[PDB]
Amino acid sequence: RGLIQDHISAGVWLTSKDSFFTREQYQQYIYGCIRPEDGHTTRSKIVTLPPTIFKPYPLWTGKQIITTVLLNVTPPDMPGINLISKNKIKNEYWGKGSLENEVLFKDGALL
Amino acid sequence: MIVPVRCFSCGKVVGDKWESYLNLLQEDELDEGTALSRLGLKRYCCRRMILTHVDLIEKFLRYNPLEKR
Amino acid sequence: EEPDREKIKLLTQATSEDGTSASFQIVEEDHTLGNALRYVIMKNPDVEFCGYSIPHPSENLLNIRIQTYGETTAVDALQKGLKDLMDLCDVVESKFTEKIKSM
Amino acid sequence: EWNVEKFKKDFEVNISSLDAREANFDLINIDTSIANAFRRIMISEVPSVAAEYVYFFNNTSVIQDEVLAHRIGLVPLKVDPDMLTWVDSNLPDDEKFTDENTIVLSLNVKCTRNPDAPKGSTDPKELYNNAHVYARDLKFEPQGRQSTTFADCPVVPADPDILLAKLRPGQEISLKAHCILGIGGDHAKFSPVSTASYRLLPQINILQPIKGESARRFQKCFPPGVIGIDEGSDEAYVKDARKDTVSREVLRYEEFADKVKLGRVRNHFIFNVESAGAMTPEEIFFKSVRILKNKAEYLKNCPITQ
Amino acid sequence: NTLFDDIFQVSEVDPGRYNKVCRIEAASTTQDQCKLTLDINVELFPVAAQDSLTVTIASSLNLRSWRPPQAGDRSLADDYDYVMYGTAYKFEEVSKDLIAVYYSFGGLLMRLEGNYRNLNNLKQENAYLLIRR
Ligand SMILES: [Zn+2]
């Protein structure tokens, strides 16, 4: 049991280091996917991360979005899942020095 | 069945533009493209509406059972 | 005539008691009002988080959640949104009328 | 910092073209959520007047009653939709339709043969009488008040030439359509616009200049008048980026795909609103913005329930 | 407070397969063993080869929450152009002294190589990365 077709290609696109999102966009995607009124959380409020880029403009990554959803769906009394997985996309496709096949999860945060 | 009233995709009323369009292909010896350009169907959703139509009602109407034949 | 008792509803499951986190549910709405209202709401400097979500297209429902800090109430922040949308639309109408007249 | 007055300073309108059926106008310095709000409302929520309940008394034509009823629904009527209020449903049919909420259109056509045309098929219109049933045959039937109210705005189809049905001798159509006030969101027949759409202003950022015959050769890659060259010995310039269609044909050639960038102006919106004739497109836009404002007033007035 | 600060000379600017990120390879002008590999949004912060970046790693912007800027106060970001907030996820040793630290700013990775200076750069739940130009 897993997501399929479009959801897979959407995860591939959203999770690219190239995908950035403004505070407005980030928070919108978040409430779009999490409804605390629906029992979708273990917090009864919403929590959020610091932006990836503090600079010129506050910017969040897609991986930060997956961090926010995992931080919001797991119970606050438990540390974040730690996992080293791999992708079906060789690193060579993202460049001569890019490293994108190692899936890294540290304390609930896709790194 | 009969020339649609509106173009499914856009919304522009087209049912008024059939007979003149057919006249423009007969009387003016125009071509389908230029005829549709003069009809104002400047979008392909509209273009296709009239361009592709098949007014099968003329074939249906010869079956009218309410008149002797 | 009556103050509409069913248009907007405050989802107790989604509302703090201190005072700065609510989910509101509006009936018979969608992105139409929603995305504009969240956009203006994000202009409020006292909004920490705000967004809208449709529980399901067929249901014709709109939930909009505003969680702020202790310097505003979510009902107050929402009223700030609506006053901004009304005044802004007044601006749009006014400049549109002016340019219609200028022709 | 952001205020509604700094928006009023920043918001612009430029109207390129205002036809009694089409308006092409620009909204500069707005948010996409607002332009999309106006578009969405202009399409679904702006009320218009369209046939809703067709009462047939006879239909011997080779066309299905239901189908003909839907086609009569599709006919746009040249009616100012403000002449009528909404018809409720909480109440019996005898109260539903009054002269304040309903417009009656009668259609009584009987097809005959004509006394002997020339050859034969000499079309249909000469061989037969009333062979072609058009929307122009929808006779408007007022009641009392609205009879007077429409003295100077009688009810006419916004396109009488629409062919509605084709008959044959002895075939007949008698029906009475009840036109009500409705919104384009509840059914597409109530949408007053044919096409209300926006497009972001195309921006053509030339990264390095091109000149001579490579500049004019670049110029021919875009719609005729987007790229202008005055001399070309010094620059190949953009006469008007608004003329472009973003066909992105220029990228097919290495002569350019490394010396041009193609973007858009997120703030600048090019609206195109074409009306179906029921109302003038600008008046439709006015109703759309007044509709969004009225909605914000409804949400201010409502009491937060719990 | 600060943990590491240096002026770096960019040796490579590779866009990879991206439109607004690039993996920059740089080396410190001031210490032969200091090396850097960082993915930056050049659309926000354009960079070129052989260019002078003033990289500083700090534990905070001080002079549970995050606030948009306010012209009533400033931070260490007021001194620098490009700021990222990230975490350290790996510590590798290149010699009996060389150690390479890894941060991820939501997936924008950085690999600093050194040997001893790291000892003011121990693993922490957060690292602010500030760049000047
Ligand atoms: Zn069309």
Curated annotation (Swiss-Prot), chain A:
This is DNA-directed RNA polymerase I subunit RPA190. It comes from the Eukaryota. The chain holds residues 667 to 777 of 1664 of the full protein. Present with 2840 molecules/cell in log phase SD medium. The gene is RPA190. DNA-dependent RNA polymerases catalyze the transcription of DNA into RNA using the four ribonucleoside triphosphates as substrates. Component of RNA polymerase I (Pol I) which synthesizes ribosomal RNA precursors. Besides, RNA polymerase I has intrinsic RNA cleavage activity. RPA190 and RPA135 both contribute to the polymerase catalytic activity and together form the Pol I active center. In addition, subunit RPA12 contributes a catalytic zinc ribbon that is required for RNA cleavage by Pol I. Component of the RNA polymerase I (Pol I) complex consisting of 14 subunits: RPA135, RPA190, RPC40, RPA14, RPB5, RPO26, RPA43, RPB8, RPA12, RPB10, RPC19, RPC10, RPA49 and RPA34. The complex is composed of a horseshoe-shaped core containing ten subunits (RPA135, RPA190, RPB5, RPO26, RPB8, RPB10, RPC10, RPA12, RPC19 and RPC40) where RPA135 and RPA190 form the DNA-binding cleft. Outside of the core, RPA14 and RPA43 form the stalk that mediates interactions with transcription initiation factors and newly synthesized RNA. It is found in: Nucleus, Nucleolus. Belongs to the RNA polymerase beta' chain family.
From Swiss-Prot, chain C:
It is found in: Nucleus, Nucleolus. GO terms for molecular function: DNA binding; DNA-directed RNA polymerase activity; protein dimerization activity. Present with 8680 molecules/cell in log phase SD medium. Belongs to the archaeal Rpo11/eukaryotic RPB11/RPC19 RNA polymerase subunit family. Keywords: DNA-directed RNA polymerase, Isopeptide bond, Nucleus, Phosphoprotein, Ribosome biogenesis, Transcription, Ubl conjugation. Transmembrane segments: none annotated. One of its GO terms (cellular component) is nucleus. This is DNA-directed RNA polymerases I and III subunit RPAC2. Its main location: nucleus. There is a cross-link at residue 95 (Glycyl lysine isopeptide (Lys-Gly) (interchain with G-Cter in ubiquitin)). One of its GO terms (biological process) is tRNA transcription by RNA polymerase III. The lineage of its organism: Eukaryota, Fungi, Dikarya, Ascomycota, Saccharomycotina. The keyword Ubl conjugation applies. DNA-dependent RNA polymerases catalyze the transcription of DNA into RNA using the four ribonucleoside triphosphates as substrates. Common core component of RNA polymerases I and III which synthesize ribosomal RNA precursors and small RNAs, such as 5S rRNA and tRNAs, respectively.
UniProtKB/Swiss-Prot annotation, chain D:
Signal peptide: none annotated. Gene3D superfamilies: DNA-directed RNA polymerase, insert domain, RNA polymerase, RBP11-like subunit. The keyword Ribonucleoprotein does not apply. It is found in: Nucleus, Nucleolus. GO terms for biological process: nucleolar large rRNA transcription by RNA polymerase I; ribosome biogenesis; termination of RNA polymerase I transcription; termination of RNA polymerase III transcription; transcription by RNA polymerase I; transcription by RNA polymerase III; transcription elongation by RNA polymerase I; transcription initiation at RNA polymerase I promoter. CDD domains: RNAP_I_II_AC40. GO terms for cellular component: nucleoplasm; nucleus; RNA polymerase I complex; RNA polymerase III complex. Disulfide bonds: none annotated. Keywords: Acetylation, DNA-directed RNA polymerase, Nucleus, Phosphoprotein, Ribosome biogenesis, Transcription. One of its GO terms (molecular function) is protein dimerization activity. PROSITE patterns: RNA_POL_D_30KD (PS00446). Belongs to the archaeal Rpo3/eukaryotic RPB3 RNA polymerase subunit family. NCBIfam families: PRK00783.1 (NF001988). Present with 13000 molecules/cell in log phase SD medium. PANTHER family: DNA-DIRECTED RNA POLYMERASE (PTHR11800), DNA-DIRECTED RNA POLYMERASES I AND III SUBUNIT RPAC1 (PTHR11800:SF13). This is DNA-directed RNA polymerases I and III subunit RPAC1. The gene is RPC40.
Curated annotation (Swiss-Prot), chain E:
Pfam families: RNA_pol_Rpb8. Signal peptide: none annotated. GO terms for cellular component: nucleoplasm; nucleus; RNA polymerase I complex; RNA polymerase II, core complex; RNA polymerase III complex. One of its GO terms (biological process) is termination of RNA polymerase III transcription. The keyword DNA-binding applies. Residues 14-37 are annotated as: Non-specific ssDNA binding. The keyword Phosphoprotein applies. It is found in: Nucleus. Component of the RNA polymerase I (Pol I), RNA polymerase II (Pol II) and RNA polymerase III (Pol III) complexes. Component of the RNA polymerase I (Pol I) complex consisting of 14 subunits: RPA135, RPA190, RPC40, RPA14, RPB5, RPO26, RPA43, RPB8, RPA12, RPB10, RPC19, RPC10, RPA49 and RPA34. The complex is composed of a horseshoe-shaped core containing ten subunits (RPA135, RPA190, RPB5, RPO26, RPB8, RPB10, RPC10, RPA12, RPC19 and RPC40) where RPA135 and RPA190 form the DNA-binding cleft. DNA-dependent RNA polymerases catalyze the transcription. of DNA into RNA using the four ribonucleoside triphosphates as substrates. Common component of RNA polymerases I, II and III which synthesize ribosomal RNA precursors, mRNA precursors and many functional non-coding RNAs, and small RNAs, such as 5S rRNA and tRNAs, respectively. This is DNA-directed RNA polymerases I, II, and III subunit RPABC3. The gene is RPB8.
